[PDB]
Amino acid sequence: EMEKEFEQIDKSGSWAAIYQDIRHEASDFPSRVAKLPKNKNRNRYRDVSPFDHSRIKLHQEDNDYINASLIKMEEAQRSYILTQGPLPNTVGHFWEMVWEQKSRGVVMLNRVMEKGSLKCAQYWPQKEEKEMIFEDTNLKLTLISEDIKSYYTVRQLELENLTTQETREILHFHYTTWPDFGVPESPASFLNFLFKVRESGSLSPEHGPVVVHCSAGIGRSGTFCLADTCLLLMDKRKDPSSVDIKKVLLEMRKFRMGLIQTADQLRFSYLAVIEGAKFIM
Numbered sequence: 001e002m003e004k005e006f007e008q009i010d011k012s013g014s015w016a017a018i019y020q021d022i023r024h025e026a027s028d029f030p031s032r033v034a035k036l037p038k039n040k041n042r043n044r045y046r047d048v049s050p051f052d053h054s055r056i057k058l059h060q061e062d063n064d065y066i067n068a069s070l071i072k073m074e075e076a077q078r079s080y081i082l083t084q085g086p087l088p089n090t091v092g093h094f095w096e097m098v099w100e101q102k103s104r105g106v107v108m109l110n111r112v113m114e115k116g117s118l119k120c121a122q123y124w125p126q127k128e129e130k131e132m133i134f135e136d137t138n139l140k141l142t143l144i145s146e147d148i149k150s151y152y153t154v155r156q157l158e159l160e161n162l163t164t165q166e167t168r169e170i171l172h173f174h175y176t177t178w179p180d181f182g183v184p185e186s187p188a189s190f191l192n193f194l195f196k197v198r199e200s201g202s203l204s205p206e207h208g209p210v211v212v213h214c215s216a217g218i219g220r221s222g223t224f225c226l227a228d229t230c231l232l233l234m235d236k237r238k239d240p241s242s243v244d245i246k247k248v249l250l251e252m253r254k255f256r257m258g259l260i261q262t263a264d265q266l267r268f269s270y271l272a273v274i275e276g277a278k279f280i281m
């Protein structure tokens with residue numbers, strides 16, 4: 001059981017050590033398309049690249065590249081698209097990916113400004129009456145409603161394909177209170193937020209995979225997917241204590257590099273799963 005293993009690593013202060021074992025054990029696959037010089041401007045960080053095997057393609061014949069990975073968890077029957085925070089020049093690409101993959105939800109785990117720098121372009125409208133047109137991808141985006149709570153905001157958006165005049169409702173789940181440094185003290189607000197995304201039906205097999213992002217799409221984004229998958233595996237298995245969080249993280253790293261950036265994020269993920277398991281048992 002991981003609750004016991006938590007006290008072990010904690011009392012022995014071994015988090016840096018576990019985390020390094022995971023670093024060394026993690027898959028390494030080619031990322032050739034990401035490093036093409038034509039794609040340099042489409043990447044927020046030169047050291048964070050999708051693997052060729054798991055990358056999302058845009059359907060535009062011109063240049064199909066976006067910094068986005070499909071994570072398929074076969075036993076949990078859960079998929080996720082992890083992506084970087086959009087750049088000023090890739091906001092149209094982001095929404096074209098959301099349109100093509102038939103996603104129902106976008107989960108955002110960062111503020112647009114953190115530590116006095118832009119972590120992300122402002123890629124959605126701030127006012128009902130000021131909609132956004134992405135000329136490069138022929139899409140229109142409208143704010144329908146916005147529900148601001150203490151720890152997170154939920155927004156209702158209409159995405160319209162100007163080419164075919166089809167429209168879809170997108171839910172934007174924005175966690176607003178992840179601290180600039182370190183991790184939340186308690187995982188309660190994060191778990192609440194994750195249960196709210198689940199309730200929406202954004203994580204359901206009826207729809208395309210949820211799109212999850214922070215700045216790089218590996219740290220906070222990793223914690224989100226890891227917690228959701230582990231909790232779902234605990235519902236599904238005859239013995240819930242058979243779920244090894246290190247095994248699940250390693251399976252997820254076959255699909256995108258660097259998921260969980262720090263030993264703090266690893267500790268927080270254990271804590272989120274352990275606490276979440278109480279609300280599930």
Ligand SMILES: CN(C)c1ccncc1
Pocket residue numbers: 040041042043044045087088089
């Ligand atoms: C490469 N990169 C992070 C950027 C591209 C375009 N505008 C601002 C930043």
